[PDB]
Design a protein around this ligand. Structure first.
Ligand SMILES: Nc1ncnc2c1ncn2[C@@H]1O[C@H](CSCC[C@H](N)C(=O)O)[C@@H](O)[C@H]1O
Lengths: 163, 161
């Protein structure tokens, strides 16, 4: 079972998604992609970038946001254990108490998440990774990495090789 | 003087470094780059890449590891409060307790750090990022972000909005 469900809404920049595929494979997360993507999906490019088949073969691809909600049995209005990562959020990523299988939703690199998705979530389900005043948002793949490793830490790193 | 010192040894892959520059500026860390660089350092290329001058203007550039140690007044026999990320490490990055002005050292994505650096550090100063069995290399910017945010969390996110 998926440590976390990492959900990218209309991702734009190929290397970010490539980095996230690698991250999810290393940590036991299930990656979900919501179309339209800003790049064309291509098995051959993913392999050339160094990704192994089993890293990308089992990614879930969703036609649109409501189809993602329906597929994952998330209540469209008040979705269970869905958190949106946004600079517009309230709690820090480390202030949420994660559970296995939580859904973590990230926006596109240029636009961020649409207003109708954020306006429908309560403040406590919109997570802001801390940044200094005046900052440029995070790189998308860095944002995902930070939240994934924080959640995994809280969970006691289930599935990690021990040293 | 710095909240945290992020130190890249022989940074290779130019977009990784760019992403780290932005991470450091967002979190309020002091970035150090130890030569030789694997790419050509050019303010005009950094700007074309989306970085703003204030993000890179105050980076500390060092000619080699010893020059870094000397600039920072660290003892090469056992550098104090320097934590090196390495698959050869013992504690998880989250299993050590960070302090203001700590040094967090990262080698290239693939090669990692040389023995002359790691041999001077005790086991508890060599940190690893946990991974599942049969994992593959994590992107270096993503790794640095993980370590930085864990250390900055432990400090109480000082400076965060
Ligand atoms: N500080 C932060 N906290 C939480 N998520 C962040 C973040 N910085 C970037 N992200 C994630 O990365 C995605 C792409 S960055 C989008 C930036 C957009 N200009 C904006 O107004 O914020 C975001 O949609 C969000 O999911």
């Amino acid at each position: 079972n998926a440590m976390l469900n990492i959900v990218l809404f209309e991702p734009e920049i190929p290397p970010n998604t490539g980095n996230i595929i690698r991250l999810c494979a290393n940590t036991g997360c299930q990656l979900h992609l919501i179309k339209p993507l800003g790049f064309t999906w291509d098995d051959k490019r993913l392999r050339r970038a160094g990704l192994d088949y089993h890293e990308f073969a089992d990614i879930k691809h969703h036609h649109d946001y409501q189809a993602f909600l329906d597929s994952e049995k998330l209540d469209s209005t008040q979705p269970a254990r869905l958190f949106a990562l946004t600079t517009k959020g309230t709690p820090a990523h480390s202030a949420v108490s994660y559970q296995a299988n939580d859904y973590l939703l990230f926006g596109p690199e240029t636009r961020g998440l649409p207003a109708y998705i954020l306006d429908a979530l309560p403040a406590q389900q919109k997570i802001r990774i801390p940044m200094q005043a005046d900052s440029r948002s995070m790189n998308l793949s860095n944002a995902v990495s930070v939240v994934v490793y924080e959640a995994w830490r809280q969970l006691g790193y289930p599935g990690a090789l021990l040293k």
